[PDB]
Design a protein around this ligand. Structure first.
Ligand SMILES: [Mg+2]
Ligand SMILES: [Mg+2]
Ligand SMILES: [Mg+2]
Ligand SMILES: [Mg+2]
Ligand SMILES: [Mg+2]
Ligand SMILES: [Mg+2]
Ligand SMILES: [Mg+2]
Ligand SMILES: [Mg+2]
Ligand SMILES: [Mg+2]
Ligand SMILES: [Mg+2]
Ligand SMILES: [Mg+2]
Ligand SMILES: [Mg+2]
Lengths: 63, 95, 49, 243, 110, 95
RNA sequence: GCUAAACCUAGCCCCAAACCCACUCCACCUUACUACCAGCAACCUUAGCCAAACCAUUUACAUAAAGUAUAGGCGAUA
RNA sequence: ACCCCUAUACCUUCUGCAUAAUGAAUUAACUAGAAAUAACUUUGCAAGGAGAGCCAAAGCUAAGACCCCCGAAACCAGACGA
RNA sequence: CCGAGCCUGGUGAUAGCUGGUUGUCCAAGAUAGAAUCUUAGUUCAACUUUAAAUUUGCCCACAGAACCAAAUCCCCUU
RNA sequence: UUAAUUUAUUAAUGCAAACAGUAACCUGCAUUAAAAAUUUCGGUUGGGGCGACCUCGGAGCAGAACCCAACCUCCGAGCAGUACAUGCUAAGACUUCACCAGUCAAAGCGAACCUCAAUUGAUCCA
């Protein structure tokens, strides 16, 4: 009787639970959902990744 | 005091949320100064006859400098607060 | 479209046809976001009604 | 890995955890308030909706404050709400011209102020804005009292306010003998305000200072265990006697 | 979804007609949709390629296909070119013959 | 043209295109001829007339424009009395 | 036949959950690891690479509304 | 097994390389195509589709399938050095 | 290794430049021009690939294509 | 640096703001300096430099449908003149090998009873 969606069955990291995403997109989600309570050394890394990823997608490849 | 209009528009963030700001929102454009304004005059009740500038008991509009650096410190006058106004009126009536 | 709906049972003409009823029937889907201001009645089935 | 609580909440947590919890309820409330101060260096968007140009359409209009900077000179004496503004200007106010940094300073002064509740003349760094405020509130004391803690803008001012509150509470002799009537009159001027004596002690304090005060209050010497033991023994004896 | 009311005279205005009882005995049968329409559809694969699809076919699809071919050969002057898929009881016929197909189906009594 | 945005992670529209062109639902792109509000004196009447017409974009151009915008600008919009409403859908095509 | 080869399990990664650490004695801001003598004190926009195919304004740092309204050498882009 | 006849290493870069153009002693292990709009495909349903919002003059939901690596001189922020 | 130190960070800086891009087999497959701080690049066109829909496509024969050579265009039959 | 854009720093001034009186020191806004600070240093080219050229049109090369280069050979243009229906619109075409720009134009409605080879320049902004 549609009490629960199958997406509520899945156990995982909170930022991607029933949410498919993309590399860059996933990073962004992580930064928003969790980043506040994230380890300084890792938050910085995440930010860097995001910076890189944007550059790679929005500029670097083909087509 | 300087009033500083903000160039570049803060992008408007919610009821209970701070709006994060950018190094271009840090750019301002000064609209006005509180200085370079028409000098206003302040109301005082005189506790003593002063020269021709005031009559005892009366409520006068003085130059602010004169109010702040002569009259008030020397007990020659008091602010136009509604509190003491009544008292002064009463005194006048009595007189 | 309206006629078709009537024929099919959904949207009862013995009751009033308000927007809500139409929506329930699922003749007219509308969406306030993307600024729809409701239904407009159109001439397309003028005769044969 | 991940933290339990975010980093912006750590300070809050700290309060709960230790000595800061032993601070009273009425004081921590002040710390927690942190309202929006009075606008000084910007004209506010008084109405929440305006209807802008370009398109005839109402839209929301929030007013985001200019950050402000108070250098530690301003903690020593009453400046207004105003402090140093740190910003950037476009050169001749065209955006296509160069952008260059700017510091806008308040016009400072040095002036005496007699305070009825304190019976003393305080030389103060006093901006024109402060003077104006004082005039508006009539008395300097009144201004000090009336001015909300965020609004007041100075440690010195806060201290003064606290002192005034204390005076109001205790009803201590400021004018000494031969002026009881005068004192009474003064008190009656400020029947408004006048918080309980215990609260007025804590008013206008930093966090660290408050903590220190708390520590001082509950320091003491450790009580001899021997005494306690003796007491216990006595109690036991009494019990025995009873039975 | 409600089953449609029993009208006085068929075919109803807006050219509707129910699936006639009893079922017409044949090698094939065509179910109707949710909405009680006879399921023949237009489709445009590329920008160019235009086709029609009968997709609720049941039993002997081959027979149905043959019948369709017989029907449509006099209009085109061809053998229509049909891709039947046996698994999902469907029939990709090349070119639009949608309305006509529907009419034919109605006549048959599905 | 920002294939993935910073915050939402969606594609963005180049708003130049939006400013300048009208996408019909059929996917024609309509444009005002360039040089149409300029140096009209020296121009012959015929030329002026030509320049005051709208024009349909080339296939390649259309494709470019489609890429440059998001699917929002390609939706069906049921305006009350937009003068272009009749051109959105296409009639009587054949290859 | 020498050189060599081979070999799982140290441990580690990513989650989840839960808010951590910190005086045996002695020493440790003087030249730290030093037993023992008369004067200071913290707060003050980030930038630039880079993108704009140069470069000066300018370039981000739950879901849906929405990449919408707006901004912008009205362009990059935001 | 040689002896006879046939036979201008490889990669890259080139209009064109046996070139006397680059690279590479050899073995071992490590070492470089990753992103959606729009298309196509096959399912599902179908004047509707979709587990709200979005799209819909045959559509819509679904999956599948395209978009590298190494390398400056540089610029700036904050430390450390006579 | 001072025309402006060294270290860390921004920094996987940036390179229209160079070098490199790793299983098998088959198939189709070559350089008209444009603009362009542009000719070491690019974006249109042209050629090229695939998947579609289609009706004509190439070879062409008489007629025909100003005045101030070779040929070509057009072009029914085939 | 006598290329451009800036002066936030220092410079004095000047006007405010503060002041006092009588019949200076600080902040805000202007000024020109000094000092600096961002910054860039177009292309074609029988190497580059120097010189010349860089947009448009007519003639030859290019002899007969178009098209066709060179720092090949030769002329020129960057306007005039007449109108003031150089009014509206509109089938159907051409097109400088793309796009943008250009060109021609039947009918109709309004009215009467264009010349010229080139004679020009997008967008945003004003
Ligand atoms: Mg919200
Ligand atoms: Mg750049
Ligand atoms: Mg450069
Ligand atoms: Mg070489
Ligand atoms: Mg650079
Ligand atoms: Mg020495
Ligand atoms: Mg690189
Ligand atoms: Mg082959
Ligand atoms: Mg050159
Ligand atoms: Mg030369
Ligand atoms: Mg052409
Ligand atoms: Mg005519």
């Amino acid at each position: 009787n549609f009490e629960k969606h199958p997406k509520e069955l899945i156990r995982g990291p909170i930022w991607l639970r029933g949410w498919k995403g993309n590399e860059l997109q996933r990073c962004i989600r992580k930064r928003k959902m969790v980043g506040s309570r994230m380890f300084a050394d890792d938050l910085h890394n995440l930010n860097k990744r995001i910076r890189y990823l944007y550059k790679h997608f929005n500029r670097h490849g083909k087509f | 005091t300087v009033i500083v209009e903000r160039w570049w528009k803060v992008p408007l963030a919610g009821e209970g949320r701070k709006p994060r700001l950018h190094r271009r929102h840090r750019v301002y454009k000064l609209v006005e100064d509180t200085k370079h304004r028409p000098k206003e005059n302040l109301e005082l009740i005189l506790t003593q006859s002063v020269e021709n500038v005031g009559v005892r008991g009366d409520l006068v509009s003085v130059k602010k400098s004169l109010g702040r650096n002569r009259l008030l410190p020397q007990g020659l006058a008091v602010y136009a607060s509604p509190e003491n106004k009544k008292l002064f009126e009463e005194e006048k009536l009595l007189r | 479209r309206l006629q078709y709906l009537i024929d099919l049972g959904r949207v009862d003409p013995s009751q009033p046809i308000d927007l809500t009823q139409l929506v329930n029937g699922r003749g007219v889907t509308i969406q306030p976001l993307k600024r729809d201001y409701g239904v407009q009645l159109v001439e397309e089935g003028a005769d044969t009604f | 890995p991940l933290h339990k609580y975010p980093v912006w909440l750590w300070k809050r947590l700290q309060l709960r955890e230790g000595i800061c919890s032993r601070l009273p309820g009425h004081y921590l409330r002040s710390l927690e308030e942190e309202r929006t101060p009075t606008p000084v260096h910007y004209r506010p968007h008084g109405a929440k909706f305006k209807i802008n140009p370009k398109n005839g359409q109402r839209e929301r209009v929030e007013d985001v404050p200019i950050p402000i900077y108070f250098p530690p000179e301003s903690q020593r004496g009453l400046w207004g709400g105003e402090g140093w503004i740190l910003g950037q200007i476009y050169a001749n106010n065209d955006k296509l011209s160069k952008r260059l940094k700017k510091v806008w300073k308040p016009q400072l002064f040095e002036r005496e102020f007699y305070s009825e509740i304190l019976d003393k003349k305080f030389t103060v760094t006093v901006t024109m804005r402060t003077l104006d405020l004082i005039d508006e509130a009539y008395g300097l004391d009144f201004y000090i009292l009336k001015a909300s803690g965020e609004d007041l803008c100075s440690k010195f001012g806060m201290d003064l306010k606290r002192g005034m509150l204390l005076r109001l509470a205790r009803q201590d002799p400021q004018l000494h003998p031969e002026d009881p009537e005068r004192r009474a009159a003064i008190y009656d001027k400020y029947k408004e305000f006048a918080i309980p004596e215990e609260e007025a002690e804590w008013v206008g304090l930093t966090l660290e200072e408050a903590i220190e005060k708390q520590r001082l209050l509950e320091e003491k010497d450790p009580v001899p265990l021997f005494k306690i033991y003796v007491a216990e023994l006595i109690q036991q004896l009494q019990q025995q006697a009873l039975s | 979804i409600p089953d449609p009311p029993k009208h006085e005279h068929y075919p109803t205005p807006s050219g509707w007609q129910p699936p006639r009882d009893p079922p017409p005995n044949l090698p094939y049968f065509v179910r109707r949709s949710r909405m009680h329409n006879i399921p023949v559809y237009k489709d445009i694969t590329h920008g160019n390629r235009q086709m029609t699809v009968i997709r609720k076919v049941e039993g002997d699809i081959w027979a149905l296909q043959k019948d369709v071919e017989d029907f449509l050969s006099p209009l085109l002057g061809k053998t229509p070119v049909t891709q039947v898929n046996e698994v999902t009881g469907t029939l990709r016929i090349k070119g639009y013959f949608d309305q006509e197909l529907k009419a034919w189906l109605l006549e048959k009594g599905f | 043209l920002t294939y993935f945005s910073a915050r939402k992670g969606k594609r963005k529209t180049v708003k130049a295109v939006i400013d300048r062109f009208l996408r019909l639902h059929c996917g024609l792109w309509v444009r005002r001829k360039a040089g149409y509000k300029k140096k009209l004196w020296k121009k012959t009447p015929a030329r002026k007339k030509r320049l005051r017409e709208f024009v349909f974009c080339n296939k390649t151009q259309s494709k470019l424009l489609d890429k440059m915008t998001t699917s929002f600008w390609k939706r069906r919009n049921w305006y009350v009395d937009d003068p272009y409403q009749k051109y959105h859908d296409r009639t009587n095509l054949k290859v």
